[PDB]
C-alpha cells in the first residue's frame, strides 16, 4: 500500500538530471535563409567533453548574417571532425564528414547523424556515441526520404530535414566492461539518480508487487498489459515474447 520507486521518479525531486557540468544543449544551427538557399561556413574551435554524455561536443563558430557578431553553436562531434576544420551547413553544401545538409540533397546510402525528425527541430536522430542514419530511399514528389534508424526501424522524414555527415564520435564505448560498482557509480553520478537498483523480489509486499513470501519468487506473471496503470507496471510491460530468441 505504498507508492513504488518507478512511480516516485515522475515527481522529479531526487530523480532529475545532474546538469551542472554539461556544456549546453547540443543542437543544430537554427534553420534560416543561409541554410535554406545556399550554405554557411563554420569553424570548429574546440572538441570538448560533455558530462554524462559518451560523445564529444564540437564547438562550431559561425558569423551572424544580419549583425556583426559571432554565434557559437554547439554540435555533437562527428568521428573525423578536428579542431580548425571549416564546417559547412546549408543546402548547397558539399558532402564531407561534419557538413550539414538536408536529407533530400544527399544521395542514397549516405551516412548521417544529428538528424532532424521535423525540419528545424535542431537534431533528434543518431546522437548517441557511434550511431548513425542510413538513407535508404526517396520520394521526390511530396518530398520525403526513407531512413534506417539506429534501432533498425524505418522512418519517413521530410527532405527539408537536416543531418550531419558521419557517425557520432565516441563509438565502441559500451564495449568496455565497467568491472566494478565504482565505475558505474561515476557514470551515473553525472547523469541522474537511477543507480543502484534493488530487485522488487527482494522487498516487502507493501513496496513492490513482486516482494514478500517465504522465498524470493515473483508470484504472478511478470508480463503486464499496456492497459494497466502505475503500480501494476512493475515487470515486463506489454511484452510480445519472453526469454531467449531461440526458434
Partner RNA sequence: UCUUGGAUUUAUUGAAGACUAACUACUGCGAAAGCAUUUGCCAAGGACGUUUUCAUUAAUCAAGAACGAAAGUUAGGGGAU
Partner RNA sequence: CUCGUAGCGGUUCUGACGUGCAAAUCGAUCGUCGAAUUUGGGUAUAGGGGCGAAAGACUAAUCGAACCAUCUAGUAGCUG
Partner RNA sequence: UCACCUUGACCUAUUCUCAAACUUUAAAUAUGUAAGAAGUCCUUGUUACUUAAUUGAACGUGGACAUUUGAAUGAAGAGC
Partner RNA sequence: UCUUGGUGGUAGUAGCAAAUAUUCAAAUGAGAACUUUGAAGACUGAAGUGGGGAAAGGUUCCACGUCAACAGCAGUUGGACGUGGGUUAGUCGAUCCUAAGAGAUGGGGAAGCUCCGUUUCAAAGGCCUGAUUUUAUGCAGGCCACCAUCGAAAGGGAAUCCGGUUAAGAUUCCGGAACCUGGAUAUGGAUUCUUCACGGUAACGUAACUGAAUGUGGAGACGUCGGCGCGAGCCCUGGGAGGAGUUAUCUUUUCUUCUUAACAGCUUAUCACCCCGGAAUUGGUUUAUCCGGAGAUGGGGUCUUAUGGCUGGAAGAGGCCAGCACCUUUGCUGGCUCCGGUGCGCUUGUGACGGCCCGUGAAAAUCCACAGGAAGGAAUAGUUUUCAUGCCAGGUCGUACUGAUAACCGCAGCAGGUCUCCAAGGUGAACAGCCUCUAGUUGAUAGAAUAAUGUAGAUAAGGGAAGUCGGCAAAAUAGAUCCGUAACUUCGGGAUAAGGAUUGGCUCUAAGGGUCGGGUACGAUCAACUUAGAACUGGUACGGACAAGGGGAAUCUGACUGUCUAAUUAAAACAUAGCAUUGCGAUGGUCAGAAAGUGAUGUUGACGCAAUGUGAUUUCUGCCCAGUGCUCUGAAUGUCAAAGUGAAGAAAUUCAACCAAGCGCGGGUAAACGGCGGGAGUAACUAUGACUCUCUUAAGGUAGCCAAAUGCCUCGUCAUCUAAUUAGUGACGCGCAUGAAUGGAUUAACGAGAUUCCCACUGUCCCUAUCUACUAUCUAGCGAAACCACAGCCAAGGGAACGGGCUUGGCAGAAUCAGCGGGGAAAGAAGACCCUGUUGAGCUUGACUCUAGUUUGACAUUGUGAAGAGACAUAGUUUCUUUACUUAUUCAAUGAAGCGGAGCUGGAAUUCAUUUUCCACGUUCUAGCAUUCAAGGUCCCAUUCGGGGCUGAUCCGGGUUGAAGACAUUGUCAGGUGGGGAGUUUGGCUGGGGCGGCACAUCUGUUAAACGAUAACGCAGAUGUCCUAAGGGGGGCUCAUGGAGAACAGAAAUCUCCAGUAGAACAAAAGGGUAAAAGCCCCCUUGAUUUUGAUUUUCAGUGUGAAUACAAACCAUGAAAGUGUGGCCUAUCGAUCCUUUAGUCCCUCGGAAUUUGAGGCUAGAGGUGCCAGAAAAGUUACCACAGGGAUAACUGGCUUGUGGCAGUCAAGCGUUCAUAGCGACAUUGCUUUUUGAUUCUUCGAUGUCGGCUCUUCCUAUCAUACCGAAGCAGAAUUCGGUAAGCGUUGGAUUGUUCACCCACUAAUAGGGAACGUGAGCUGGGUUUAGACCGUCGUGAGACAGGUUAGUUUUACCCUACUGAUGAAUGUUACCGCAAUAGUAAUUGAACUUAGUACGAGAGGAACAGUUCAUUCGGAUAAUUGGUUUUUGCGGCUGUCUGAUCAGG
- Minimal distance, residue 73 CB to RNA, in Å: 12
Cβ atoms of residues 49 and 38 within 8 Å = no
For RNA (CB under 7 A), the number of binding residues is 164
- Applying the rule CB under 7 A, the residues between 181 and 240 that interact with RNA are 181-187, 189-210, 212-240
Q: Choose from Mg ion, RNA, none: what does 105 bind? Cβ within 5-8 Å by kind.
A: none
- Applying the rule CB under 7 A, the residues between 112 and 171 that interact with RNA are 117-121, 124-131, 136-137, 149-151, 153, 155, 160, 168, 171
Which residue is at the shortest CB distance from Mg ion? 199
Rounded CA-CA distance 65/63 in Å is: 6
- Which residues are registered as beta bridge partners of 75? 58
Residue in 118, 183, 199, 220 binding Mg ion, rule: CB under 5 A: 199
- Minimal distance, residue 210 CB to Mg ion, in Å: 12
Q: Is 10 strand, coil or helix? A: helix
Q: Choose from Mg ion, RNA, none: what does 139 bind? Cβ within 5-8 Å by kind.
A: none
Rounded CA-CA distance 73/27 in Å is: 8
Rounded CA-CA distance 75/100 in Å is: 11
- Which residues are registered as beta bridge partners of 103? none
- Applying the rule CB under 7 A, the residues between 83 and 112 that interact with RNA are 83-86, 88, 90, 92-94, 96, 99, 108-109
Q: Is residue 8 at the binding interface for Mg ion, with CB under 5 A as the rule?
A: no
- Applying the rule CB under 7 A, the residues between 38 and 77 that interact with RNA are 38-41, 43-45, 49, 51-55, 63-70, 76
Cβ atoms of residues 77 and 56 within 8 Å = yes
Rounded CA-CA distance 88/180 in Å is: 43
Distances (CA, A) of 133 to 106, 113, 114, 155, 168: 12, 6, 9, 10, 10
Amino acid at each position: 500500500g505504498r507508492v513504488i520507486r518507478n512511480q516516485r521518479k515522475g515527481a522529479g525531486s531526487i530523480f532529475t538530471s545532474h546538469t551542472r557540468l554539461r556544456q549546453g544543449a547540443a543542437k543544430l544551427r537554427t534553420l534560416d535563409y543561409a541554410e535554406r538557399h545556399g550554405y554557411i561556413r563554420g569553424i570548429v574551435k574546440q572538441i570538448v567533453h560533455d558530462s554524462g554524455r559518451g560523445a564529444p561536443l564540437a564547438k562550431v563558430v559561425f558569423r551572424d548574417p544580419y549583425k556583426y557578431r559571432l554565434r557559437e553553436e554547439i554540435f555533437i562531434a562527428n568521428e573525423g571532425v578536428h579542431t580548425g576544420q571549416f564546417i559547412y551547413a546549408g543546402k548547397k553544401a558539399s558532402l564531407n564528414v561534419g557538413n550539414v545538409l538536408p536529407l533530400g540533397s544527399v544521395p542514397e546510402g549516405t551516412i548521417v547523424s544529428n538528424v532532424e525528425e521535423k525540419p528545424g527541430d535542431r537534431g533528434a536522430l543518431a546522437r548517441a556515441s557511434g550511431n548513425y542514419v542510413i538513407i535508404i530511399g526517396h520520394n521526390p514528389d511530396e518530398n520525403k526520404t526513407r531512413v534506417r534508424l539506429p534501432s533498425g526501424a524505418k522512418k519517413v522524414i521530410s527532405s527539408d530535414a537536416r543531418g550531419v555527415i558521419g557517425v557520432i564520435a565516441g563509438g565502441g564505448r559500451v564495449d568496455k566492461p565497467l568491472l566494478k560498482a565504482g565505475r558505474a557509480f561515476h557514470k551515473y553520478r553525472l547523469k541522474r539518480n537511477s543507480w543502484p537498483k534493488t530487485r522488487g523480489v527482494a522487498m516487502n509486499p507493501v513496496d513492490h508487487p513482486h516482494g514478500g513470501g517465504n522465498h524470493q519468487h515473483i508470484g504472478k506473471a511478470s508480463t503486464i498489459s499496456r492497459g494497466a496503470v502505475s503500480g501494476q507496471k512493475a515487470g515486463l510491460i506489454a511484452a510480445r515474447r519472453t526469454g531467449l530468441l531461440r526458434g
